[PDB]
PDB file of C-alpha atoms (C1' of nucleotides) and ligand atoms in Angstrom:
ATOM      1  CA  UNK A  29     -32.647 -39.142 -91.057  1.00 48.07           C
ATOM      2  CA  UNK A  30     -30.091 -40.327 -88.470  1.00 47.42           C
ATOM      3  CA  UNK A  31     -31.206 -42.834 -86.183  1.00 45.02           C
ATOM      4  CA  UNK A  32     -29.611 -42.174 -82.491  1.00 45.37           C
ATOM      5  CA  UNK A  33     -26.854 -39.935 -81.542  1.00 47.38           C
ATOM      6  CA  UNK A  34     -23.895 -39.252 -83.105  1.00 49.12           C
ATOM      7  CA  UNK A  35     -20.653 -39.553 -80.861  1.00 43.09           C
ATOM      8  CA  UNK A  36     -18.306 -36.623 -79.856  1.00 40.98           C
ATOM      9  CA  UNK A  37     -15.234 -37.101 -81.338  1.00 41.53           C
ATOM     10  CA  UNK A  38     -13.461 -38.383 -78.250  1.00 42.35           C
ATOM     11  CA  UNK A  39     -15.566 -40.920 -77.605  1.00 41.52           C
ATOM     12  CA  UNK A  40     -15.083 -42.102 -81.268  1.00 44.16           C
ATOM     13  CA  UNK A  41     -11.808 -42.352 -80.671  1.00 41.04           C
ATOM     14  CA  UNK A  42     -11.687 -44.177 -77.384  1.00 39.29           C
ATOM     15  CA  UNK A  43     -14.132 -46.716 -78.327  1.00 38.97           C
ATOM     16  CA  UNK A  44     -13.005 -47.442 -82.044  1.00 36.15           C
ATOM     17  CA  UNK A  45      -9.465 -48.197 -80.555  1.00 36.53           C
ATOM     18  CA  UNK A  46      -7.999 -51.141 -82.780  1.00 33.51           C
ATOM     19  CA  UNK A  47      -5.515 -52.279 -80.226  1.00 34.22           C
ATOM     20  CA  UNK A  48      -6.902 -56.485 -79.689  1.00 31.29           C
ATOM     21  CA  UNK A  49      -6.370 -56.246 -76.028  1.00 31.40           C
ATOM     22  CA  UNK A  50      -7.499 -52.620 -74.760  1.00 32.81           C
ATOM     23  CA  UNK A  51      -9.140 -52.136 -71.337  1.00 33.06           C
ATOM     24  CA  UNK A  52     -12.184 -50.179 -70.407  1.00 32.18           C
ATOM     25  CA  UNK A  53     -14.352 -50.397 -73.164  1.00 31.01           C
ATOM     26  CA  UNK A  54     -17.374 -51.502 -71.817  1.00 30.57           C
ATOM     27  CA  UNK A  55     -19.739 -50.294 -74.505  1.00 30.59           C
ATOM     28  CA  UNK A  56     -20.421 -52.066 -77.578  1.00 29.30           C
ATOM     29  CA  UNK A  57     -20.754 -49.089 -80.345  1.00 30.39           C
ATOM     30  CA  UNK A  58     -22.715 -50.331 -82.974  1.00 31.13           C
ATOM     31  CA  UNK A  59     -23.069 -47.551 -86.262  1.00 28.65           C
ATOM     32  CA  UNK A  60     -24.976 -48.526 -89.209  1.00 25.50           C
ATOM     33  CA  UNK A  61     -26.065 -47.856 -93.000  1.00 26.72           C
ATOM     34  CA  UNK A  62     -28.403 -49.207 -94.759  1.00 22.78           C
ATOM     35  CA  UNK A  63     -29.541 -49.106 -98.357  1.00 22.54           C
ATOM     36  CA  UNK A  64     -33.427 -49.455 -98.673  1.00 20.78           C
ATOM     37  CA  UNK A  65     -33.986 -50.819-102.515  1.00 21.64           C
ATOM     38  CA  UNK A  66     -38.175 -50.956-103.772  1.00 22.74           C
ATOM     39  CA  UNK A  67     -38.430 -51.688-107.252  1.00 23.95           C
ATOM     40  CA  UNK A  68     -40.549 -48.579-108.655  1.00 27.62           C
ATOM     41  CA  UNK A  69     -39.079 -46.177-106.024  1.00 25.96           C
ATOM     42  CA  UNK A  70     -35.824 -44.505-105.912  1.00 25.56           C
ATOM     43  CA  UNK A  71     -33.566 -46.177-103.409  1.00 27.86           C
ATOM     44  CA  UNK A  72     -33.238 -44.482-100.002  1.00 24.18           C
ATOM     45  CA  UNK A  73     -30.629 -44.555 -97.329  1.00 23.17           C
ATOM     46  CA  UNK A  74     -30.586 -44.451 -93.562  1.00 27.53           C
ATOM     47  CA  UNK A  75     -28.249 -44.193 -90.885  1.00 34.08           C
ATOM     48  CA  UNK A  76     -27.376 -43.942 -87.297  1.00 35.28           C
ATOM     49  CA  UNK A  77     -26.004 -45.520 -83.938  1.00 36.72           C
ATOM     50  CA  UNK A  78     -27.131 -47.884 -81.389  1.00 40.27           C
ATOM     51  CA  UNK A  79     -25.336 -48.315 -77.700  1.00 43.67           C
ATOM     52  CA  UNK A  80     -26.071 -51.201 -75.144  1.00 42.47           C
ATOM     53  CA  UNK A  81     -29.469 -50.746 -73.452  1.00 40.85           C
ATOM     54  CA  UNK A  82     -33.697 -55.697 -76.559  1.00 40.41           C
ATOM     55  CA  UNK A  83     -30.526 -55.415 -74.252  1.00 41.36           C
ATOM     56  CA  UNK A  84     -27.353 -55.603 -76.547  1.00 42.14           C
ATOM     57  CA  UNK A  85     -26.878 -52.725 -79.135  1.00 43.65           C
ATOM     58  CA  UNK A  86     -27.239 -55.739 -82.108  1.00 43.43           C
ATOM     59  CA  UNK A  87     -30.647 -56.986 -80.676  1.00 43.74           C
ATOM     60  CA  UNK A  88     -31.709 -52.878 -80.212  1.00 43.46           C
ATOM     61  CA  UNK A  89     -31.098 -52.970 -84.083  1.00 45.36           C
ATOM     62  CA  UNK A  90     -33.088 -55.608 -84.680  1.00 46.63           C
ATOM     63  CA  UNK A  91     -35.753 -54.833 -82.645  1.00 45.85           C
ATOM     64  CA  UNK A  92     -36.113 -50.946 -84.222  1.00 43.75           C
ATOM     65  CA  UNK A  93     -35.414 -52.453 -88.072  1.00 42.62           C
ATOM     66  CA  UNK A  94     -38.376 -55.083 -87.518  1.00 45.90           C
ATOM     67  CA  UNK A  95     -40.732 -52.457 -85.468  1.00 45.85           C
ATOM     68  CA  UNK A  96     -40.199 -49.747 -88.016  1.00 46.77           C
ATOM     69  CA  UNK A  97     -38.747 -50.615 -91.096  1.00 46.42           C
ATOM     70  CA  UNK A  98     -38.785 -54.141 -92.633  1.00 44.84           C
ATOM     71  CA  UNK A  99     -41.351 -53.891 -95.639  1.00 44.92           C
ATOM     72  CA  UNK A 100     -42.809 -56.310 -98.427  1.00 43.87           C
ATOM     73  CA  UNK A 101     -40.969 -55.950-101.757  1.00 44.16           C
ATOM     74  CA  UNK A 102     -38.298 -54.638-100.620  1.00 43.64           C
ATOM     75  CA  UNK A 103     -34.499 -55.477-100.335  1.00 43.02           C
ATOM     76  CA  UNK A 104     -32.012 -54.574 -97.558  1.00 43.68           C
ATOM     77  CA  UNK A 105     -27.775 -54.023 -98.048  1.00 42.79           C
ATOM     78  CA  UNK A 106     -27.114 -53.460 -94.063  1.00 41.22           C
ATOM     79  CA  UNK A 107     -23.659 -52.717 -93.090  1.00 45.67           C
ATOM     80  CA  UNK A 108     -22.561 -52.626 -89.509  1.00 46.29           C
ATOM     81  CA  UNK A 109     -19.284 -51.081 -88.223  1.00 47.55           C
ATOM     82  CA  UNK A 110     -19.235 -52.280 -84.439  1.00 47.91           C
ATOM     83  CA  UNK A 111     -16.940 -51.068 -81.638  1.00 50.70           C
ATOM     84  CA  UNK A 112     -17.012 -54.908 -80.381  1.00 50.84           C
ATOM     85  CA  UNK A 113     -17.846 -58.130 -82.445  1.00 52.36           C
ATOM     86  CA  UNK A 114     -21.070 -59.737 -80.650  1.00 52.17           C
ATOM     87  CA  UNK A 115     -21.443 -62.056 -78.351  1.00 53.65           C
ATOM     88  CA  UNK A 116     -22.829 -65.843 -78.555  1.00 51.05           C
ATOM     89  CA  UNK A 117     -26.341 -64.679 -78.114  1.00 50.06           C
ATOM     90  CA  UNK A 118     -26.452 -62.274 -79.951  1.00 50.43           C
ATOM     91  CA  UNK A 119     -24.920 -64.058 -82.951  1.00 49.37           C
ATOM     92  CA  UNK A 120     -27.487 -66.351 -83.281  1.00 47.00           C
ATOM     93  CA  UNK A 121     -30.429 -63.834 -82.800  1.00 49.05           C
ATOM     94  CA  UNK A 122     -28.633 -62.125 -85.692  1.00 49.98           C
ATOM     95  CA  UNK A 123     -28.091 -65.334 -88.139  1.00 44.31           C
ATOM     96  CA  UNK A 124     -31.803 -66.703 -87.086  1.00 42.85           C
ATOM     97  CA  UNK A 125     -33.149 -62.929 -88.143  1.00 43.25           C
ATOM     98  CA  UNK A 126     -31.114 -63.381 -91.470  1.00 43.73           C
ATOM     99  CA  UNK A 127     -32.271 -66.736 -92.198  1.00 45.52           C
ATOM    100  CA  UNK A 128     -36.126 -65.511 -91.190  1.00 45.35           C
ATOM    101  CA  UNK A 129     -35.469 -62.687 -93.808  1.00 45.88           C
ATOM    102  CA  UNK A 130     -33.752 -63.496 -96.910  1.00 46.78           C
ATOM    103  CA  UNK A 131     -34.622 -59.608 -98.291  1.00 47.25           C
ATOM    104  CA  UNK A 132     -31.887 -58.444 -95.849  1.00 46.97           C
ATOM    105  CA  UNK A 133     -27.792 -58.338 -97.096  1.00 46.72           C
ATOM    106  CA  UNK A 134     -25.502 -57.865 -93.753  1.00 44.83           C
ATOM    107  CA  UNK A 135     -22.455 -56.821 -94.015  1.00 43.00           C
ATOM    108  CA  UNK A 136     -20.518 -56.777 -90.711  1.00 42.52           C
ATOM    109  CA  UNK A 137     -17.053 -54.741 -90.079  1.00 37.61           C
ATOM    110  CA  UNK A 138     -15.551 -54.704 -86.644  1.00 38.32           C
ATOM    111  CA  UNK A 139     -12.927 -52.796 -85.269  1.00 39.71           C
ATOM    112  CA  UNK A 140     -11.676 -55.295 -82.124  1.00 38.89           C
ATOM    113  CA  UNK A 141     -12.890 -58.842 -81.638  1.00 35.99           C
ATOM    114  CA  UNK A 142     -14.501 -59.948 -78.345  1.00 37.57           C
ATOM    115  CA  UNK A 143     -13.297 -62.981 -76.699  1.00 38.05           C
ATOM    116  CA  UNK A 144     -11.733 -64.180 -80.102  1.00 37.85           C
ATOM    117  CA  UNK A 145      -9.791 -66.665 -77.713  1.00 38.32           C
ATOM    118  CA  UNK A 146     -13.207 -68.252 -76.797  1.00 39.94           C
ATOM    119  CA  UNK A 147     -14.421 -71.052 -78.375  1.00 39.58           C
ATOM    120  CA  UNK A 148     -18.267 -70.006 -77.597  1.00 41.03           C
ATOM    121  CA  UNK A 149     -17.910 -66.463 -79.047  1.00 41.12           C
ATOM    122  CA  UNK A 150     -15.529 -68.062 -82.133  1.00 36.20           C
ATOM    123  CA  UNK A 151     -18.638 -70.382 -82.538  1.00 37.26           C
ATOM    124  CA  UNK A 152     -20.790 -67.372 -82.556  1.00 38.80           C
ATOM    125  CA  UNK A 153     -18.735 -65.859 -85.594  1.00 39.76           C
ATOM    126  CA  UNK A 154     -18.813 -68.772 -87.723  1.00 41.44           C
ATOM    127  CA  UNK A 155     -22.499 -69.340 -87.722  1.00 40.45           C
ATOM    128  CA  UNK A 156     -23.051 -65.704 -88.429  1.00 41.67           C
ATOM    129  CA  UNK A 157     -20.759 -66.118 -91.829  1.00 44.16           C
ATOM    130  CA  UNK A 158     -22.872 -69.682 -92.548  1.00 47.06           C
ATOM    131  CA  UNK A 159     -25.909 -67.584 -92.641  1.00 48.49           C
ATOM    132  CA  UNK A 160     -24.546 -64.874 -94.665  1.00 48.71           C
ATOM    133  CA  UNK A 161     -23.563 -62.303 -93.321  1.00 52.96           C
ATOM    134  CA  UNK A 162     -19.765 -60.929 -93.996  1.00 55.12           C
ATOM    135  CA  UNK A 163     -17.809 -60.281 -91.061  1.00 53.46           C
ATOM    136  CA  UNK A 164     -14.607 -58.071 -91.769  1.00 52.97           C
ATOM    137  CA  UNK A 165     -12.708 -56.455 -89.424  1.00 52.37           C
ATOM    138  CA  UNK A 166     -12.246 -52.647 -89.858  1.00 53.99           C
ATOM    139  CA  UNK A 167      -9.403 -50.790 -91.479  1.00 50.73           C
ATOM    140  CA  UNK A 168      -8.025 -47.373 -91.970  1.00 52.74           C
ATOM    141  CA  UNK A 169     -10.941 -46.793 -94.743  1.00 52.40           C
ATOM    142  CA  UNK A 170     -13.698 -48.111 -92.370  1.00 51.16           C
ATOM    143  CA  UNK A 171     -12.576 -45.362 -89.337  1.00 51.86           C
ATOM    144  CA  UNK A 172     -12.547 -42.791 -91.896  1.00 49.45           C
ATOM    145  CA  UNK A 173     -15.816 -43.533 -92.872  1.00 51.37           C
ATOM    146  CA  UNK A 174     -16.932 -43.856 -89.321  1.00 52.86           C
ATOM    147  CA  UNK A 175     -15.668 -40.744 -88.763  1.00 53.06           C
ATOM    148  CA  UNK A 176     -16.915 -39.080 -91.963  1.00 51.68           C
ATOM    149  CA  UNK A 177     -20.571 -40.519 -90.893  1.00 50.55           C
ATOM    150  CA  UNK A 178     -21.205 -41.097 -87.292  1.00 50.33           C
ATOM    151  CA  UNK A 179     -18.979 -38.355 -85.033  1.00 48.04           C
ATOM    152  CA  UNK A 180     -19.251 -34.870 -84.660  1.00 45.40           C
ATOM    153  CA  UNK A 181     -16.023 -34.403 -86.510  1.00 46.06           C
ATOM    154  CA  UNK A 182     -16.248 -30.833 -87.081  1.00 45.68           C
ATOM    155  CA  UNK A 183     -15.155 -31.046 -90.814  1.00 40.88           C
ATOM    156  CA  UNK A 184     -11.890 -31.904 -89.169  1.00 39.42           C
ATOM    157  CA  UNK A 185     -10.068 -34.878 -91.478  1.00 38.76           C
ATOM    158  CA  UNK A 186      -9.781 -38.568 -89.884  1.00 40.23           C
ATOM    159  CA  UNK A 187      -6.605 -38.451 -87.735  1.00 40.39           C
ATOM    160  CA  UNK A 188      -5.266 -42.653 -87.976  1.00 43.14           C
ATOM    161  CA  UNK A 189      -3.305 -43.359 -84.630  1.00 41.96           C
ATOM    162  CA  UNK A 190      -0.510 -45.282 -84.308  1.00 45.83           C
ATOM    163  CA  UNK A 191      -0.734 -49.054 -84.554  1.00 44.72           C
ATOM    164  CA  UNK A 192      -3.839 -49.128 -86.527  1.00 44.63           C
ATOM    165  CA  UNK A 193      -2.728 -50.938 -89.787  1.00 44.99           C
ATOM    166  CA  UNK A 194      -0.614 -53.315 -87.268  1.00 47.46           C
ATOM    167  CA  UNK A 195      -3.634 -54.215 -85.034  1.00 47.02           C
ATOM    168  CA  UNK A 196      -6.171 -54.183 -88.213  1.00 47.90           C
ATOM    169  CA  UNK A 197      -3.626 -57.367 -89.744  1.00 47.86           C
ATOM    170  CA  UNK A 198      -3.381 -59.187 -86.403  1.00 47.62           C
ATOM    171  CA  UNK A 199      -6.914 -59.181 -85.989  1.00 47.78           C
ATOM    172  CA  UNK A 200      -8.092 -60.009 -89.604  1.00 48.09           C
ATOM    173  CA  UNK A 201      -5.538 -63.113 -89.073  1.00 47.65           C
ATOM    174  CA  UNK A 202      -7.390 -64.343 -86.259  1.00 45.90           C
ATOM    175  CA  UNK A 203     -10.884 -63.840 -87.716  1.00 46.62           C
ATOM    176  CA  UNK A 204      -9.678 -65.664 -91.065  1.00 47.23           C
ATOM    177  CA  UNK A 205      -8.414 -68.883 -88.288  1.00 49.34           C
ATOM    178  CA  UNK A 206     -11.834 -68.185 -86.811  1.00 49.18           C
ATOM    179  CA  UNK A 207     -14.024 -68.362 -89.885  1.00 47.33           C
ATOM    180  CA  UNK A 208     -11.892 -71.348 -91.627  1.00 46.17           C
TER     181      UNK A 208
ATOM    182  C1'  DA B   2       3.868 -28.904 -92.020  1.00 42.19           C
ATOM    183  C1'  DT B   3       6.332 -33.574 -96.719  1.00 41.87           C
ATOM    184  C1'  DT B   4      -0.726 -32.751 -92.117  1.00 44.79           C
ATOM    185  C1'  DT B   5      -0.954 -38.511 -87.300  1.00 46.89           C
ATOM    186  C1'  DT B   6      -2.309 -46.346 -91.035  1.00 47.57           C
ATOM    187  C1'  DC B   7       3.690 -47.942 -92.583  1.00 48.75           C
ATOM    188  C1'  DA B   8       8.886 -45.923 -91.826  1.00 47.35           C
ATOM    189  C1'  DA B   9      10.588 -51.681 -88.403  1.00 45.85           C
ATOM    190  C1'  DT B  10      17.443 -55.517 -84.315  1.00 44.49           C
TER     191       DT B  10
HETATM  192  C1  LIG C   5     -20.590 -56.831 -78.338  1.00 44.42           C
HETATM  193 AS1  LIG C   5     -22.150 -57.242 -77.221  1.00 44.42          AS
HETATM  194  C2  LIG C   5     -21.552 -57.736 -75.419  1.00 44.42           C
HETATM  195  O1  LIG C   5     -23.182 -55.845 -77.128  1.00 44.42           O
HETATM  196  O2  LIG C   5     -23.031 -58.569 -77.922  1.00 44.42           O
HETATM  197 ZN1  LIG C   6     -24.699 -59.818 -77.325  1.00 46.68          ZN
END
DNA sequence: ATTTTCAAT
């Protein structure tokens, strides 16, 4: 039902930090759903959370979706909501696996974006979007989601910290530059 | 609690 561990509710909070800059994160959080449409079944959903450590938490998603999931006849609407955007390598492991499998929709939020300033890693973003993937990066509705879905929130409601609206436009300004 | 995004020389 839920792939991988769900994250305490401080750890949530440390790594889906919006601020562009912050120090110390040095895990890439990487939580996922996925709709799972068959045409004469009902559609099913699954969910869940990969860390770093086949290395990189993107590649340990693709690695588990092609060793256990991906199926004949069957369409895939993936959305990602990473802690980190990816890096270079990973990017084009992703957009080669999307253009292999035209059956899977990725839709990619992200709450910070890693070496934006890079022109390898912008590189990386750009041929992600050419194969089709979306790359967003999250706002207030994507945390509470996160939160809603992949923490051990306790029933306790989404609590937005300071900043987060400011950081979310700053960074969406970049990736738009980026992605141009 | 007017229940933590925004409230800004
Ligand atoms: C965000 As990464 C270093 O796991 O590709
Ligand atoms: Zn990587």
């Amino acid at each position: 039902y839920f792939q991988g561990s769900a994250m305490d509710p401080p750890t949530f909070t440390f790594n889906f930090n919006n601020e562009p800059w912050v120090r110390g994160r040095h895990e890439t959080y990487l939580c996922f759903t996925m709709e799972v449409v068959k045409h004469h079944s009902p559609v099913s959903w699954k969910r869940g959370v990969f860390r770093n450590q086949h290395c990189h938490a993107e590649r340990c998603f693709l690695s588990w979706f092609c060793d256990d999931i991906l199926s004949p006849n069957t369409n895939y609407e993936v959305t990602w909501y990473t802690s980190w955007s990816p890096c270079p390598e990973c990017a084009g492991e992703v957009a080669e696996f999307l253009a292999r499998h035209s059956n899977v929709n990725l839709t990619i939020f992200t709450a910070r974006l890693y070496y934006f300033w890079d022109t390898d890693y912008q590189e990386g973003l750009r041929s992600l979007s050419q194969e089709g993937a979306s790359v967003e990066i999250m706002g207030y509705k994507d945390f509470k989601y996160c939160w809603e879905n992949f923490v051990y929130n306790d029933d306790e409601p989404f609590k937005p910290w300071k900043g987060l609206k400011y950081n979310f436009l700053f960074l969406d300004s970049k990736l738009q530059e980026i992605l141009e």
